[PDB]
Design a protein around this ligand. Sequence first.
Ligand SMILES: Cc1cc2nc3c(=O)[nH]c(=O)nc-3n(C[C@H](O)[C@H](O)[C@H](O)COP(=O)(O)OP(=O)(O)OC[C@H]3O[C@@H](n4cnc5c(N)ncnc54)[C@H](O)[C@@H]3O)c2cc1C
Ligand SMILES: Cc1cc2nc3c(=O)[nH]c(=O)nc-3n(C[C@H](O)[C@H](O)[C@H](O)COP(=O)(O)OP(=O)(O)OC[C@H]3O[C@@H](n4cnc5c(N)ncnc54)[C@H](O)[C@@H]3O)c2cc1C
Ligand SMILES: Cc1cc2nc3c(=O)[nH]c(=O)nc-3n(C[C@H](O)[C@H](O)[C@H](O)COP(=O)(O)OP(=O)(O)OC[C@H]3O[C@@H](n4cnc5c(N)ncnc54)[C@H](O)[C@@H]3O)c2cc1C
Ligand SMILES: CCOC(=O)c1ccccc1S(=O)(=O)NC(=O)Nc1nc(I)cc(OC)n1
Ligand SMILES: CCOC(=O)c1ccccc1S(=O)(=O)NC(=O)Nc1nc(I)cc(OC)n1
Ligand SMILES: C/C(NCc1cnc(C)nc1N)=C(/S)CCOP(=O)([O-])OP(=O)([O-])O
Ligand SMILES: C/C(NCc1cnc(C)nc1N)=C(/S)CCOP(=O)([O-])OP(=O)([O-])O
Ligand SMILES: [K+]
Ligand SMILES: [K+]
Ligand SMILES: [Mg+2]
Ligand SMILES: [Mg+2]
Lengths: 599, 599, 217
Amino acid sequence: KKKEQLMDDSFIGLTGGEIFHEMMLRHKVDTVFGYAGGAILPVFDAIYNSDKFKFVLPRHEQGAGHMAEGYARASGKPGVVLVTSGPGATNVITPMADALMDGVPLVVFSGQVPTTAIGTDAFQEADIVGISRSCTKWNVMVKNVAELPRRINEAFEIATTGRPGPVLVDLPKDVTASILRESIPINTTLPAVSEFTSEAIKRAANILNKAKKPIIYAGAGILNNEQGPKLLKELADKANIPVTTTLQGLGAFDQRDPKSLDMLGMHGSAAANTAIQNADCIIALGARFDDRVTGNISKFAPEAKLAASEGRGGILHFEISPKNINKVVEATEAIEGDVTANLQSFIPLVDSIENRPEWFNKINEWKKKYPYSYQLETPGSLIKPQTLIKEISDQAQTYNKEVIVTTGVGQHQMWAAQHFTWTQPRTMITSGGLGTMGYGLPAAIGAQVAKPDAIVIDIDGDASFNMTLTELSSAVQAGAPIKVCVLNNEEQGMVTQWQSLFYEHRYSHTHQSNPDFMKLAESMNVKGIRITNQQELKSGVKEFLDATEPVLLEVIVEKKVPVLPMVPAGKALDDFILWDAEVEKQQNDLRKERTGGKY
Amino acid sequence: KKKEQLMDDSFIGLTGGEIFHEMMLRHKVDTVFGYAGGAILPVFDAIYNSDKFKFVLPRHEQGAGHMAEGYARASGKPGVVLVTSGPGATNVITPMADALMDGVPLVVFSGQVPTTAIGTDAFQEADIVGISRSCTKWNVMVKNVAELPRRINEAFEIATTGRPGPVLVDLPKDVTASILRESIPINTTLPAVSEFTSEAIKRAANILNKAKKPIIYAGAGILNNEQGPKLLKELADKANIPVTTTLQGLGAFDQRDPKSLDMLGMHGSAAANTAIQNADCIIALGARFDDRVTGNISKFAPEAKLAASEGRGGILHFEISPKNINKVVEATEAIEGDVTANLQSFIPLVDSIENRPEWFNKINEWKKKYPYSYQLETPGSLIKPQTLIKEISDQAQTYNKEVIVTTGVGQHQMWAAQHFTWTQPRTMITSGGLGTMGYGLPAAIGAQVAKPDAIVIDIDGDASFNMTLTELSSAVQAGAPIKVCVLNNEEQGMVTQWQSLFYEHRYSHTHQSNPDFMKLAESMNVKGIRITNQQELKSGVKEFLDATEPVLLEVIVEKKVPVLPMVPAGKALDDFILWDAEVEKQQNDLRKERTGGKY
Amino acid sequence: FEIATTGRPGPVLVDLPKDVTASILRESIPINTTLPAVSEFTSEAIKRAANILNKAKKPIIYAGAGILNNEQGPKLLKELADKANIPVTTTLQGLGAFDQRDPKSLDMLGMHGSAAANTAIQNADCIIALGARFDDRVTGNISKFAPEAKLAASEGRGGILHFEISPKNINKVVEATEAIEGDVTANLQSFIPLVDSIENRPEWFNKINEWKKKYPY
Ligand SMILES: Cc1cc2nc3c(=O)[nH]c(=O)nc-3n(C[C@H](O)[C@H](O)[C@H](O)COP(=O)(O)OP(=O)(O)OC[C@H]3O[C@@H](n4cnc5c(N)ncnc54)[C@H](O)[C@@H]3O)c2cc1C
Ligand SMILES: Cc1cc2nc3c(=O)[nH]c(=O)nc-3n(C[C@H](O)[C@H](O)[C@H](O)COP(=O)(O)OP(=O)(O)OC[C@H]3O[C@@H](n4cnc5c(N)ncnc54)[C@H](O)[C@@H]3O)c2cc1C
Ligand SMILES: Cc1cc2nc3c(=O)[nH]c(=O)nc-3n(C[C@H](O)[C@H](O)[C@H](O)COP(=O)(O)OP(=O)(O)OC[C@H]3O[C@@H](n4cnc5c(N)ncnc54)[C@H](O)[C@@H]3O)c2cc1C
Ligand SMILES: CCOC(=O)c1ccccc1S(=O)(=O)NC(=O)Nc1nc(I)cc(OC)n1
Ligand SMILES: CCOC(=O)c1ccccc1S(=O)(=O)NC(=O)Nc1nc(I)cc(OC)n1
Ligand SMILES: C/C(NCc1cnc(C)nc1N)=C(/S)CCOP(=O)([O-])OP(=O)([O-])O
Ligand SMILES: C/C(NCc1cnc(C)nc1N)=C(/S)CCOP(=O)([O-])OP(=O)([O-])O
Ligand SMILES: [K+]
Ligand SMILES: [K+]
Ligand SMILES: [Mg+2]
Ligand SMILES: [Mg+2]
């Protein structure tokens, strides 16, 4: 009788595919990104004409994967991928690796050959559990239909807890075709703070209450709770602390606030970099001390390390994954768990501070000294890429709509980060840890599906865009009115920047040929706009943002322009290269000479 | 003094990148397919403006991978890939899995973050040695520059010996930037039959000399020696044996020869399938008894199994990889090693046979009974895809040039296999084991680079072509005048065929939207031709083949047409579905009714 | 415990970090976690297997450790051997599954098994393999193993009937004429009623008895 209460008969008579369909509904999945094939047909048959979720069909499964990532990042829900065996599955490996590195909850369901064929080098058989082991938090192959609901629950749970990340569930065709004939545990059919941590929070507060030069270093983890940005602001306001963010934390703090130091790191603000190198207390909120951020690790945060040794400061690391505590830099206090929940406990213990005259005097001087400067347009010159980004940023904020930005990877990505003004959470959707070129367009489609009333802008490089441009058709078929801006410098700019700097202007295979982007747009049934000169910039960007359909904007921009500031490999975070007009002129002359006028 | 003779100083003072360059030259590499990035820059700097090999730049590293596969398959040389760390490397996983399943010698060099950063979740770091372990024969991470020449030799050796296949060599940036300061073993700077096998060959010959109903089942392994097709023909002629081939063995035997039974298997000739089910001796030459070929394994080759039990026949398996001997079916005699070398020993022991009247009477009757029939065009109907393939096959054989065919994956692939007449080795370049949609275009570019004087035709499906169509730009930039024919049925035809047959015409997500292929071609700077009706077929195909530049031909073809014959899952090889005009009419009516006239 | 004891039984390991076993449970957990029919495909295979055995003139049971994994296993093995009048050999790991004092006992087969058992399996037209995995200590030269049963399978009058719980070990070494997947004892309950009772097999047991006399240890 109690047994009857704990077992469930309600799935008996359903196929594995039908059970999958029901479990999607129970997990409140409203969107699936995927692509059919022989091994996964029993599942596709079950979801045939389903009105329970939207299905989004890409042109390539890598597209499905990055779409699901963009969806997850925009929505805070897991991105669900459904693909076939063999090459359907191996085509999702880059998106899984990408999702792992950026903490994106991706739940990948891959068809598999029947259990009777596994291990025989069967038709369309890949060892996807073996291949994806290193780029997933967890994966599994389902071996019978009775365990399918359990494995689906486990996948969603692992994907969305701790540091979020990708999981894969392998679905043999005979399992999804088979019918459940037995009852299963009813729990499988449904989806306080430690004293140790409480004490660490108290000690952390006592340390911050001594600090004379505090700084908040905030990252993606603060975005994983709806109240995160609110509590970050409450802390910064209460204790009067300047705030810098990573690339992935952009939008966590209102950059219009005077306490904003903007982005730190290799291409972040020299003010932010100076401040963290001089701070006596660093409050690290959901950020992992990535090697793009720390500069030379041995030279990182010297004032905070000194303060820790003298018992008057240090690094206070609020981190959900023990793996990333004390991985790169020693935390003075490690506060384990969800940063937003732990901030609720922390802030009441923190003393309110009215002013910090000497510290904010330095902060304000550094901000004034270190803007994102660059060489402006001159008469007859091409549009500068930095100017283009400012133009899009300024005009997009006109509309009464949320604005979400995705990017490719390269210089355009860095100029997007620098020159947009970031004010809202989950509005920067960019591949940071893995750095996957081609991410921008499919991620924008996923973000647009997640947020159908948002303006979604893909700031893309021409080489990045070439990687995955076939997905323009997918945007049209999905009814996703994304706005793609290709910064066309006819080069892999990020790489040519390094070849200019370190390889004496030897541009080895870094200039790919581009298609005609306007005829390409036309072939894909998307609106095309081309801006070729300075006098077309404002009106072309307006036309781009006013469009109510998918649109591709191509902008011809200045070539061989470096992203600055730059902390070169090996250098301390405050040992940066700054923009200088005269240096840029000399560098142009040198490049011209070295390449016999070719570049 | 002997020590001096065995050590080599000649690489001292070179960077790892320069050593890589030199080892490419020593391995007679004439083409590298690749794409730059930060981790692999020291190697790109070393190969800057090299006149030692052609470098081919794709738009996506998956493209580089399939290009190298097409190159390897066309040339018989290893295909060399050079990519960066992180997503550059993970993007080559599908081509590696593809190459593993089809026995393609692929040598993949991936940049990696410096050894000082490995294992730190570094910028653009993937565990590519872990990820690629299951889809390579072998892989390695080079840990110091002194071992780089050795690891390069090992890679090429493993890739090209035994059953050929993919290998990966991971190249940390600090290793390729570092300079060799010490001498290294000189052997590292440079690139009889067993009595057991001799006895097996003698026993095999005695078995064949008893056979009354022999058949040769020949596959890809016969293509791995230049003399393979010659010795296959010598055996078939001498002992008077009919010859069937796999998909991957097409071209190994001249299909114009009366002894040709054409392709066997799931969609192969019902004559070939009948013959192998009735043969008393099966000579398996470089073929692996794939599950697309055997049909229901327990019901496969019953006459040969009977003959083996009665000591008058059986299966004689000439196979280079012990893993694939007795993996699927028991060999009566296993002859291990290179099939062509072992045929040189075998054929002299085999008795010449003038005629086999009763057997060839059956063979000839079966060939007459079982052509590749289909429903012909009717007035006003669309072009039938089978007719299109015959047209291309007939016209291509006009030219005084070698003709190499690549394909995508799906019905078009099967109709290409059936309806071309295959006569020369290494002219069918198709993804068979993994079955990767998107293969056709990049494989054609690689094949065209391998064979610059050949006509190279990609017979492609519209969904397959959408996967990787960005590589059209690559064909232009590489100067590869490939000929792409898109069979446009506006459907994933292979999958809709299964949904029609097994899922009552429920077409779940199997109709992707297509771009305008003519405007697409124009945007890519490639010539475009569109055939929309029967009266344009001959002249449009002529224009396509006459072109002396890259060209995309789109042909509008009949939709919802099944590939026949077909051996359904679970059925014996001789339990096939054959084309029947009346059945096709009923099936059309049923489809129309079920879908309310939509399909 | 579930994985260790189901399918083919085997070892499992659970690693217990010291801070986990020292830590105290502070939250509720799903109550299910606090507590420890035959397919039509298999039903059809059992029927075909019975029809094959009902044709056999020289059957032999090759029984192994799997028959010991159900308390009723040896009982059903004996019921089958008695009903259809079949001599029984066992592996090393199946010793004790059959009463070796029974005249139908051929003793152990294999590398160091009885030459009577080895002769009988090489001459049998139907081999009923009950919970045994065709180990390389048992089969001898695999290509030369069971030639009369292979011949019979090809002629549609015998073969190898493999009752096996682990799909990995079906068709791993030797091709089964019929594979009967699942617990051998449960499947024997279904099989035996379909099997014809046989009073005598004079010519076969004449050979069996001569071989036993000829080949003592
Ligand atoms: C060309 C290029 C240049 C780049 N240059 C820069 C640069 O100059 N500056 C820069 O900042 N980035 C740069 N990056 C990005 C960089 O590589 C990293 O992706 C980024 O810095 C990581 O930011 P993050 O630590 O906030 O996010 P993540 O990498 O996602 O790390 C988040 C951390 O927070 C933890 N966490 C997650 N959820 C929670 C939670 N609920 N509670 C507590 N903790 C949680 C995670 O476990 C993790 O340790 C660049 C990328 C590219 C492609
Ligand atoms: C949609 C679709 C349908 C298909 N249907 C069919 C079909 O109907 N018929 C068909 O044939 N295929 C079909 N295939 C292809 C099938 O999946 C396999 O790829 C193909 O049958 C393998 O052919 P193979 O054994 O000759 O080549 P491989 O898979 O390359 O196997 C070659 C064998 O020869 C060995 N070998 C290699 N080199 C040597 C050497 N030097 N000496 C000796 N041995 C060597 C290898 O080790 C290996 O065991 C289909 C594919 C797709 C995508
Ligand atoms: C020196 C030496 C010499 C040896 N020589 C011999 C010899 O001459 N003869 C000999 O027999 N052995 C010999 N062996 C032993 C041999 O190596 C194997 O261990 C033995 O033959 C395996 O017997 P088995 O197949 O019955 O048991 P196992 O290896 O346990 O195989 C049992 C099979 O039954 C299956 N099974 C398990 N439970 C069930 C169930 N409930 N229902 C259905 N199937 C089930 C299993 O999955 C498995 O496939 C020797 C060992 C040594 C050390
Ligand atoms: C592709 C998925 O392959 C398998 O899962 C499979 C693999 C090995 C053995 C048996 C099978 S299967 O029989 O279960 N299914 C099957 O072959 N399906 C199928 N679907 C289509 I669409 C096409 C096609 O052949 C061109 N085959
Ligand atoms: C991308 C390759 O990254 C590394 O190999 C690396 C990884 C971790 C730590 C240190 C290094 S590295 O210092 O050796 N090289 C480096 O950072 N190169 C680089 N190249 C470009 I082009 C851009 C860029 O940043 C945008 N960084
Ligand atoms: C090749 C490369 N990086 C290496 C690389 C290679 N391959 C992949 C899939 N991803 C990356 N990051 C870059 S950043 C060039 C980007 O060029 P772009 O997209 O035209 O952008 P931009 O010119 O603004 O630097
Ligand atoms: C989806 C699919 N197969 C599953 C699949 C999914 N994804 C990949 C990367 N490869 C494969 N093989 C096929 S065959 C449809 C092919 O459609 P097509 O290229 O238009 O060819 P055709 O219509 O001639 O069958
Ligand atoms: K900014
Ligand atoms: K043909
Ligand atoms: Mg660019
Ligand atoms: Mg199609």
